[PDB]
Amino acid sequence: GLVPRGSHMAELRPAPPAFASLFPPGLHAIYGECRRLYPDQPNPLQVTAIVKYWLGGPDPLDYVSMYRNVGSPSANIPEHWHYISFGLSDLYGDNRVHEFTGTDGPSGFGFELTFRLKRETGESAPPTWPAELMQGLARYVFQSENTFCSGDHVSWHSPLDNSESRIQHMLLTEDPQMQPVQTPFGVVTFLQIVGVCTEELHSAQQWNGQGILELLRTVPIAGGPWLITDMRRGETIFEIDPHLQERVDKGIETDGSNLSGVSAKCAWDDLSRTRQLESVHLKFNQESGALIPLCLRGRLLHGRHFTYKSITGDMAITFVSTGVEGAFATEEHPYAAHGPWLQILLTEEFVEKMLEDLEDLKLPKEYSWPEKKLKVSILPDVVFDS
């Protein structure tokens, strides 16, 4: 036989910081993860709060580091500014702002904020406005002590850079590069801010945040696997691609809807200390009517409830399934009202039947199921405004 020749490989594929004793261990651990990603930028531009939060200052974030990330146009990831906060987790461990809780569990709130902003031509330095955006979000978190996690939305209702931009709200996702770190003061994760349009915010609310985040990943301009925010983006993902709405629709059906209620134009009528009603008539305008499929397919079909509240007045309709506790409507008396608040119980089988008729979304458009003694009508706006 032949003597072994050895393998020939055809394709070869691609220290503490100075004065380490000066760094508090929580800060040290975040900085270490930053160092791993940016060995070439050991001294990034930073915004720092001179008047400290624990001495009466307004800004909870002690530091925001601002890095340049070359990205990978080879993978459709554009060049961008990468922002990382210091102060939401326990940096110092000495009870000045967070309670010291040991190595187990979250350090402070358990995360820092990050952000990725698409670089414009002629930008030789990271804009500083995102630091103040981050301060505002952190203020929100410090006031309520409500913790954010991956998939949450933030209704912000203002252009993020105070321009005229359409990016007006935020979702939160895991940073695509930054790994969680264990510190003497607890575990720290990295939550990335993703800018969105109102319509995209509305969709996360109707379906779930993880679902919209995953759609944003498939649209580079929105966009991209690393979820970079472009403040100049003029179109929604649904304007760029009409086929995405269908994924949202299917998602709501499969996962369920995170929307439990809406304020809208609507009314209910009786057709004959809660009262039980033999017959009932439900009235919606076009917009509130368009949510009925979401109500039925994304809520009742998942054992949940959904409330329509009247924009003007005390009137309300809550749909309930056989799964909920504490309802005053039951299978035997499925229409019941406490004052102007109607509850309506529908079984799985009957909502399936209603859905056969209920598409979409010439008024008045009236639906009827005489055996159930139920009518639903879509009416012109004038009915509800007067």
Question: What gap in Å lies between CA 190 and CA 172, rounded to an integer?
Answer: 10
Tell me which DSSP letter residue 72 carries.
B
What type of residue is 301? L
Q: Cβ of 196: how many Cβ atoms within 10 Å?
A: 29
Q: What is the DSSP string of 189-255?
A: EEEEEEEE-HHHHHHHHHS-HHHHHHHHTT-TTT-TTTT-B-TT--S-HHHH-TTHHHHHHHHHHHH
**β-pairing, 316-320 with 305-310?**
antiparallel
Cβ(236)–Cβ(200) below 8 Å: yes
Cited resolution, angstroms: 2.3
Beta-bridge partner residues of 111:
189
Question: What gap in Å lies between CA 69 and CA 119, rounded to an integer?
Answer: 9
Domains, the chain, with CATH or none: 1-258 (no CATH), 259-272+278-386 (3.30.1360.230)
CA neighbor of 277 nearest in space, from 354, 339, 357, 324:
339
> Which residues in 23-180 belong to E strands, given as ranges?
45-48, 63-69, 80-86, 106-118, 153-154, 169-174
Question: What gap in Å lies between CA 329 and CA 315, rounded to an integer?
Answer: 17
For residue 144, give both structure tokens. Answer: 């309520």
Q: Cβ of 107: how many Cβ atoms within 10 Å?
A: 30
Cβ(142)–Cβ(60) below 8 Å: yes
Tell me if residue 284 falls in helix, strand or coil.
strand
Supply φ then ψ for residue 173, to 5 degrees: -140, 165
Query: In the chain, what is the greatest distance between 2 CA atoms, to the nearest angstrom?
Result: 98
For residue 58, give both structure tokens. Answer: 């307004």
List CB contacts of 6: < 8 A, sequence separation 6 or more. none
